[PDB]
């Protein structure tokens, strides 16, 4: 498993990688058994090439823009959390979401599961 500091660096590139819209290396990122719930609450999504959809639906314009909004929490077992922020479009207009994401990796470093919190409580204008 990766080390506390490992996840730390781990999570905060992933973050990096979102900013850039880098779609193939974000899912890279992910274990082929990886799931993703984001926002939690709604059901996972399975796998590479669903992940790597919701990531193209989500990124794909290119103009999202990301980063954190403090340290990364980050425990012994592979497993962290983040908070960040999200910055997009709303038909025209500049909004920002709140998020904090929960990740747990696996043996080999790739991400096993990533929780993504958030609600519409969290998106501003």
Same mark, same amino acid.
């Given at each position: 498993?990766?080390? $506390?500091?490992?996840? +730390? &660096? #781990?999570?905060?590139?992933?973050?990096?990688?979102?900013?850039? *819209?880098?779609?193939? =290396?974000?899912?890279?990122?992910?274990?082929?058994?990886?799931?993703?719930?984001?926002?939690?609450?709604?059901?996972?999504?399975?796998?590479?090439?669903?992940?790597? $959809?919701?990531?193209? +639906? &989500? #990124?794909?314009?290119?103009?999202?823009?990301?980063?954190?909004? *403090?340290?990364?929490? =980050?425990?012994?077992?592979?497993?962290?959390?983040?908070?960040?922020?999200?910055?997009?479009?709303?038909?025209?207009?500049?909004?920002?979401?709140?998020?904090?994401?929960?990740?747990?990796?696996?043996?080999?470093?790739?991400?096993?599961?990533?929780?993504?919190?958030?609600?519409?409580?969290?998106?501003?204008?």
């Amino acid at each position: 498993l990766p080390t $506390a500091q490992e996840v +730390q &660096g #781990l999570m905060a590139r992933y973050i990096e990688l979102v900013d850039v *819209g880098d779609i193939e =290396a974000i899912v890279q990122m992910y274990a082929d058994d990886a799931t993703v719930e984001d926002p939690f609450g709604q059901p996972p999504i399975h796998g590479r090439e669903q992940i790597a $959809a919701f990531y193209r +639906q &989500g #990124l794909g314009g290119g103009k999202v823009r990301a980063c954190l909004t *403090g340290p990364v929490r =980050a425990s012994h077992n592979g497993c962290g959390a983040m908070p960040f922020r999200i910055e997009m479009v709303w038909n025209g207009q500049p909004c920002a979401v709140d998020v904090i994401s929960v990740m747990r990796f696996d043996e080999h470093g790739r991400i096993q599961t990533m929780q993504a919190y958030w609600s519409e409580v969290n998106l501003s204008v």
